[PDB]
Design a protein around this ligand. Structure first.
Ligand SMILES: *Cc1cc2c(cc1C)nc1c(=O)[nH]c(=O)nc-1n2C[C@H](O)[C@H](O)[C@H](O)COP(=O)(O)OP(=O)(O)OC[C@H]1O[C@@H](n2cnc3c(N)ncnc32)[C@H](O)[C@@H]1O
Ligand code: HEM
Ligand SMILES: Oc1c(Cl)c(Cl)c(Cl)c(Cl)c1Cl
Ligand SMILES: O=C([O-])CC(=O)C(=O)O
Ligand code: SF4
Ligand code: F3S
Ligand code: FES
Lengths: 239, 138, 613, 102
């Protein structure tokens, strides 16, 4: 028999000026799955179903969980509960974001920012599209590993202090790493205009190499290292 | 709906709501490279304040540097209080110096992996101490 | 009612669902200059297609030389001849064009030494119509194909003027005299009610695998479109044919790709034998889904299983070059660890046959148009389409072929796009709707919203899931099935005895996970009742009491000195199921399979045969 | 569209190595030239740096305009002062020297 405590951020938008408060729950860990989501689900099912959160895959590929657990941003479905009964787990919504309800942040801006980099392949001549597979050597292809696997979970950008103070105009690591993913895609023709789109104070340059992003990626990616690669490209490119 | 309209919509929705912003600094777990980052901010801000205060007092205050040095020899401080006032000036400087080097290695793209940040973090921290004590001893 | 804010929308088209199939349909319509709306209860990228691992089939001729007609043959065979050959012809032909579309879109396929799309071996695929041995036509992005597919599709979709109702919950269709007028949805964000009316409506809501206790499916795989169709009084085809993927992780039931076997991964029991060598001599470990899982689940019957409570098998990978395991199978390596604490390059993964895919769904044209059944005949339902796992053009038949669903998605996504593109014009007269329309959904919503019953949504869902698990598994008998039937029908009654707690408008996940249970019930009801009625062993459906394939002939011996069985006497036919919304009474009937391809000259019909690997 | 943002980024990195290199050189070669080029590098790099902190934290259009205007004034007086000190006083190399043997 093993009880664990969970301190969980709460807020009901329909409860007339309800104020954000922590609610604590208790879970027999022998009666629960290894991961934090398993507990989040178990309390939803048996204890309180007024608890509201985003989940889907429970396998860590949809990037639906993405919340603040014990100070760090990962995916609940992938983060395992600390067997240490002495520590009380503290579950929060993703930092410096608007809470719609409980652990549910308004991710609209995060998405709008992703749209803005135009995250798709672009050719100068698009007449011949649809009819032949494009050439790309494994060499040109290796340059994509650790970039394409991004889950758009928003753990990174939402851990970046620069994104906290300047989330509106600063694109943040997740988006920025993607713009780079398309920059180094051999099949893309618009590398110069992708860079030229980041010529302002805020879009790229609010990054001060804090490195929370890489430090927190639940997928073990290095958004920050890509941000520095963009920076080099920004300085050295022509026209 | 454009990306810009979407952003524009995001702000006008939320600023006219009663939604709370989720906690951040007050909850987010600090790490060695995170702390070493605001310290780069602080030390820089302090160092610039020092220099600003130096050139500004050179324009407003009467008497030369030599006048102010003798002015200081008044109620002359203990060797272990002139060294303290000496160490608390090279510490802000020597730190921001070594981490600034680290920031440039980074601009070059070298050593940006997490375990490399825990290595480059300690090495800067030690070099700070060794060069802060080294210089206040001169 | 009356107190709910009903907002109206007028479009040319509406796509319910933004998985692979949904997105392809959605910008496909926009691409063609149609004022399209998409409705999805998740963020497009969260959709289950994003979890897809193995790859996407097409006879591109990159590895060896290929013919899409061999792909055809494999598919129809694998379908155990419940598969409509007109659709299979369409799909397998459109495949190379479709994959090249995706690559051209930006999909970062793994590459060959020629800088072409890397393809690999997969379960039960051959060259030269089953003669030229194992074929390598499964196109992949290393290990995260669905993920990459969904992302590139989402990427592409930003380029067109489509309107995306993200986290909107489609409640029902808007129907008027057998004609689809649009949808009625819940804006999860504020809890408001939206009636979107369009001239055409595409339903791409994915599977309902979450009718079971253990499945590789997303928590959000709940047959919501399936049920909207059932609530319309429309038929649902072949819902009893449920795919049990051989290799899903023993614990949480996460998927380990079939690409493991495709790359040379072996399956081993407690005795140590490569049991997929005596169970299926020719194709071996890389055989059909139903045969492999049948063998696995049969191996546990013998007692030769591995584990603590004695209930799983071992997928082996360690003998493969670890370098190969790093390039081909990176995604499973994390999850094999994370969810099982297993090092892929050292120890064998613990796997178990678990629910994976729903070949059953809404009956469909090869054109994507939803079929009803009138006078023993097919009738196209005006203004209504379906595609992907939610659909049943039955390109997959009685057993879906590995790497064919992602293909299904994009092919027919495009089909629905084009069918509308050809059948009408943008700006065409969008049909009107009653001021009273959808009132039934809003009412059932409000009823569920304030429910003061005796049973928790969670508790009833668990009853359904464990019932289906013990009464509709890999092996079936009428005794267990009939008990399973009444079991489910009993639980259907309990839907007026359900307790909800959350009574808020904004993000009422309590309320929706109930609407989903409503939805899941309707699905499981038809699945189990369909399974009861079918008295044969075809594809995924295996009856202990009817071990044999009941066809119009006995295709084991030669067909001629032989009299053909009448329709309602053999079983080689599609199951159509309905249910009265109030009583939960499943009535059902049948329509014929299609054997004629789109052209006999280009692609020969393949007549039924003994199906074995 | 110019590449102004990326040039200003590089500009900074240049004065940084310039200022990094100027420290040993001020110890090894204490002179009046050193005294002036240290004054330039000190004030520029500091001005750009606080500029970063200004852009980061000073939300608003009125405030951002002022905070930069005063920062410019602060850096102008700081440079003029160090130039005055190098001309009509000890000079910064010698100033440190005098201050350190103390
Ligand atoms: C489970 C699984 C399946 C799978 C796979 C791996 C796993 C773990 N790997 C595959 C592979 O490698 N190759 C392949 O060919 N298939 C593979 N599969 C099967 C396949 O991925 C799925 O069957 C298929 O992707 C289903 O996709 P579809 O496009 O039909 O839709 P979806 O991705 O499941 O998502 C459904 C969308 O519909 C929306 N929805 C659902 N209900 C509603 C309501 N009420 N209102 C509004 N929208 C709704 C969802 O939001 C979602 O976007
Ligand atoms: C010892 C040599 C020095 C080097 C190599 C150096 C280098 C740097 C670098 C690379 C940064 C930017 C780091 C980032 O990207 O966030 C920086 C920040 C800054 N520095 Fe220095 N520096 C040095 C000394 C000084 C001195 C003596 C002052 C005082 C005038 C100073 C004032 C600042 C300020 C105000 C900032 C901005 C803080 C920030 O935005 O984070 N530096 N320095
Ligand atoms: O503004 C900042 C904040 Cl809030 C933190 Cl926590 C850090 Cl580490 C840094 Cl570097 C900056 Cl600039
Ligand atoms: O449904 C599929 O084709 C497959 C699947 O689980 C895989 O091998 O990734
Ligand atoms: S880079 Fe990592 S943390 Fe950021 S959105 Fe992508 S997967 Fe999430
Ligand atoms: S957390 Fe930050 S400011 Fe840059 S290195 Fe990472 S985005
Ligand atoms: S639920 Fe899909 S990542 Fe956690």
């Amino acid at each position: 028999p093993r009880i664990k405590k969970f301190a969980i951020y709460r807020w009901d938008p329909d409860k007339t000026g309800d104020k954000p408060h922590m609610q604590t729950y208790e879970i027999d860990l022998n009666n629960c799955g290894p991961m934090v989501l398993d507990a989040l689900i178990k309390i939803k099912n048996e204890i309180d179903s007024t608890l509201t959160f985003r989940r889907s895959c429970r396998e860590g590929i949809c990037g639906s969980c993405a919340m603040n657990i014990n100070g760090g941003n990962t995916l609940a479905c992938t983060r395992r509960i600390d067997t240490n009964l002495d520590k009380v787990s503290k579950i929060y919504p993703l930092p410096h974001m608007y809470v719609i309800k409980d652990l549910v942040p308004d991710l609209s801006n995060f998405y709008a920012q992703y749209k803005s980099i135009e995250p798709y392949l672009k050719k100068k001549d698009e007449s011949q599209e649809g009819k032949q597979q494009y050439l790309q050597s494994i060499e040109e292809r290796e340059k994509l590993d650790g970039l394409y696997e991004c889950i758009l979970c928003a753990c990174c950008s939402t851990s970046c202090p620069s994104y906290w103070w300047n989330g509106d105009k600063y694109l943040g690591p997740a988006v920025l790493m993607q713009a780079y993913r398309w920059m180094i895609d051999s099949r893309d023709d618009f590398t110069e205009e992708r860079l030229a789109k980041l010529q302002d104070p805020f879009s790229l340059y609010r990054c001060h190499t804090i490195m929370n992003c890489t430090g927190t990626c639940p997928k073990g990616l290095n958004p920050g290292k890509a941000i520095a690669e963009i920076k080099k490209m920004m300085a050295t490119y022509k026209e | 709906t454009t990306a810009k309209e979407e952003m524009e919509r995001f702000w006008n929705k939320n600023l006219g709501s009663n939604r709370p912003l989720s906690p951040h600094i007050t909850i987010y777990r600090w790490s060695l490279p995170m702390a070493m980052s605001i310290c780069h901010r602080g030390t820089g801000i302090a160092l610039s304040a020092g220099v600003s205060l130096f050139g500004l007092s050179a324009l407003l205050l009467p008497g030369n540097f030599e006048s102010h040095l003798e002015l200081v020899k008044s109620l002359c401080l203990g060797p272990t209080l002139i060294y303290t006032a000496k160490f608390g000036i090279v510490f802000p400087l020597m730190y921001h110096t070594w981490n600034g080097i680290r920031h440039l290695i980074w601009d070059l793209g070298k050593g940006l992996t997490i375990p490399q940040l825990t290595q480059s973090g300690v090495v800067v921290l030690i070099l700070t101490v060794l060069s802060s004590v080294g210089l206040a001893a001169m | 009612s009356t107190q709910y804010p009903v907002v109206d929308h007028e479009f040319d088209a509406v796509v319910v669902g933004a998985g692979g199939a949904g997105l392809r349909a959605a910008f496909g319509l926009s691409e063609a200059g149609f004022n399209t709306a998409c409705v999805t209860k998740l963020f497009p990228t969260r959709s289950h297609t994003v979890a897809a691992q193995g790859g996407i089939n097409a006879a591109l001729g990159n590895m060896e030389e290929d013919n899409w007609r061999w792909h055809f043959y494999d598919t129809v065979k694998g379908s155990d001849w419940l598969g409509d050959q007109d659709a299979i012809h369409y799909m397998t032909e459109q495949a190379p064009a479709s994959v090249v579309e995706l690559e051209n879109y930006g999909m970062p396929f793994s590459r060959t030494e020629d800088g072409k799309i890397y393809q690999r071996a997969f379960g039960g695929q051959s060259l030269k119509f089953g003669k030229g041995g194992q074929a390598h036509r499964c196109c992949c992005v290393a290990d995260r194909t669905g993920h990459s597919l969904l992302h590139t599709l989402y990427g592409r979709s930003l380029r067109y003027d489509t309107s995306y109702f993200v986290e909107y919950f489609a409640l029902d269709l808007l129907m008027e005299n057998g004609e689809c007028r649009g949808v009625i949805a819940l804006c999860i964000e504020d809890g408001s009610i939206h009636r979107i009316r369009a001239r055409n409506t595409v339903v791409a809501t994915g599977g309902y695998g979450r009718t079971y206790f253990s499945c590789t499916s997303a928590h959000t795989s709940t047959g919501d479109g399936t049920a909207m169709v059932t609530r319309a009084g429309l038929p649902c085809q072949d819902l009893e044919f449920v795919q049990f993927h051989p290799t899903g992780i023993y614990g949480a039931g996460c998927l380990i790709t079939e690409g493991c076997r495709g790359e040379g991964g072996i399956l081993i029991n407690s005795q140590g034998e490569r049991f997929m060598e005596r169970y299926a001599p020719v194709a071996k470990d890389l055989a059909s889904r139903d045969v492999v899982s049948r063998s696995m689940t049969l191996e546990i019957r013998e007692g030769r299983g591995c584990g603590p409570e004695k209930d799983h098998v071992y997928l082996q990978l360690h003998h493969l070059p670890p370098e190969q395991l790093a390039v081909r199978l990176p995604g499973i390596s994390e999850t094999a660890m994370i969810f099982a604490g297993v090092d892929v390059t050292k120890e064998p993964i613990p796997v178990l046959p678990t629910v994976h895919y729903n070949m059953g769904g809404i009956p469909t044209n090869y054109k994507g148009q939803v079929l009803r059944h009138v006078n023993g005949q097919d009738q196209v339902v005006p203004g209504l389409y379906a595609c992907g796992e939610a659909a049943c053009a039955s390109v997959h038949g009685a057993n879906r072929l590995g790497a064919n669903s992602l293909l299904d998605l994009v092919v027919f996504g495009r089909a629905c796009a084009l069918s509308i593109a050809e059948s009408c014009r943008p700006g065409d007269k969008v049909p009107s709707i009653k001021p009273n329309a959808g009132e039934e959904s809003v009412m059932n919503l409000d009823k569920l919203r304030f429910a003061n019953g005796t049973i928790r949504t969670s508790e009833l869902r668990l009853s359904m899931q464990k019932s289906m698990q013990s009464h509709a598994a890999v092996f079936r008998v009428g005794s267990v099935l009939q008990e399973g039937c009444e079991k489910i029908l009993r639980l259907y009654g309990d839907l007026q005895h359900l307790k909800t707690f959350d009574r808020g408008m904004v993000w009422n996940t309590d309320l929706v996970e109930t609407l989903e249970l409503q939805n899941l019930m309707l699905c499981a009801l038809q699945t189990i009742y369909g399974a009861e009625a079918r008295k044969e062993s075809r594809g995924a459906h295996a009856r202990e009491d009817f071990k044999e394939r009941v066809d119009e002939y006995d295709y084991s011996k030669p067909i001629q000195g032989q009299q053909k069985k009448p329709f309602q006497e053999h079983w080689r036919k599609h199951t159509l199921s309905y249910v009265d919304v109030k009583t939960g009474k499943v009535s059902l009937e049948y329509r014929p399979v299609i054997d004629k391809t789109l052209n006999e000259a280009d692609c020969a019909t393949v007549p039924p045969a003994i199906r074995s690997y | 569209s110019s590449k102004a943002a990326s040039l200003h980024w590089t500009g900074e990195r240049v004065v940084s190595v310039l200022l990094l290199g100027l420290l040993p050189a001020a110890y090894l070669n204490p002179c009046s030239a050193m005294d002036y080029s240290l004054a330039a590098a000190l004030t520029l790099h500091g001005h750009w740096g606080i500029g970063q902190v200004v852009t980061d934290y000073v939300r608003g259009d009125a405030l951002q305009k002022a905070a930069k205007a005063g920062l410019l004034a602060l850096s102008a007086f700081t440079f003029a002062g160090l130039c005055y000190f190098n001309y009509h006083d000890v000079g910064i190399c010698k100033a440190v020297a005098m201050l350190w043997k103390l």
